[PDB]
Amino acid sequence: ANQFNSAIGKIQDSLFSTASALGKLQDVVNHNAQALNTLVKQLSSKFGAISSVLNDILSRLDPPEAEVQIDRLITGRLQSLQTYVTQQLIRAAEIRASANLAATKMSECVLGQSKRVDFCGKGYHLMSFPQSAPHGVVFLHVTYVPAQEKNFTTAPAICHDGKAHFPREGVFVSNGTHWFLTQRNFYEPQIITTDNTFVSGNCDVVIGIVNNTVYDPLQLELDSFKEELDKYFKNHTS
């Protein structure tokens, strides 16, 4: 909880003071504004006509002569409009791809926990929280990152009684003298028993198998009670 609180506190600094991100939405706004500005400034061009104002062409020319200049302006402005619309369609397709991706991320990162790697952040996904930005969505991806790694000596299996033992879930490790069974992503040593290991064949096929004893709790309790019963029987006999 403390680590998550610290990260969410640092979020407000790693968003607006470090630049980096938040430039995609600003780029979208800038591109749209630039397209509109170029379109509106294309109205001042002449495109070969005497003047860029239709009123000025009409007030100084007879109809038959003004047809040519008005037509030059019409052709130029139609070309500019067509260019604007085509660029807008291409940009709309790009933004639709981005919006489909945002919808997928909301469905899979926020509404559930995602197993897809790097889809919802760098690390193992824990969850995600949405926020709304102008013309966009901002996901805060909470992920779990392994922190302090220690290197142990590992083995693929254990041959205790001539039968190879494989881990049920986790790996065999050794710190130098003793052998434990820990989980994959967090060092939690546990004594290798018959509960967390399964037998598969003898120990003459696996490459790298090591020698260790595997504790059997059932046999331990059975031996204890058998020893007690044998002592009682010996006392009764003599």
């Binding site: 680590q3 995609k24 979208v28 919006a99 952040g121 790694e149 142990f152 060092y187």
Partner: protein
């Protein structure tokens, strides 16, 4: 005396994985990392 300098791109650190023959590195702690992902909608 600040100036404009040109270099060749550095792709990151040069870390050689200590891939041994029977050794494994297990993490012993963790971190809760909150990253950000901004998407035009």
């Amino acid at each position: 005396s600040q100036s404009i300098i040109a270099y060749t791109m550095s792709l990151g650190a040069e870390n050689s994985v200590a891939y041994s023959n029977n050794s494994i590195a297990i993490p012993t702690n963790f971190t809760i990392s909150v990253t950000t992902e901004i998407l035009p909608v």
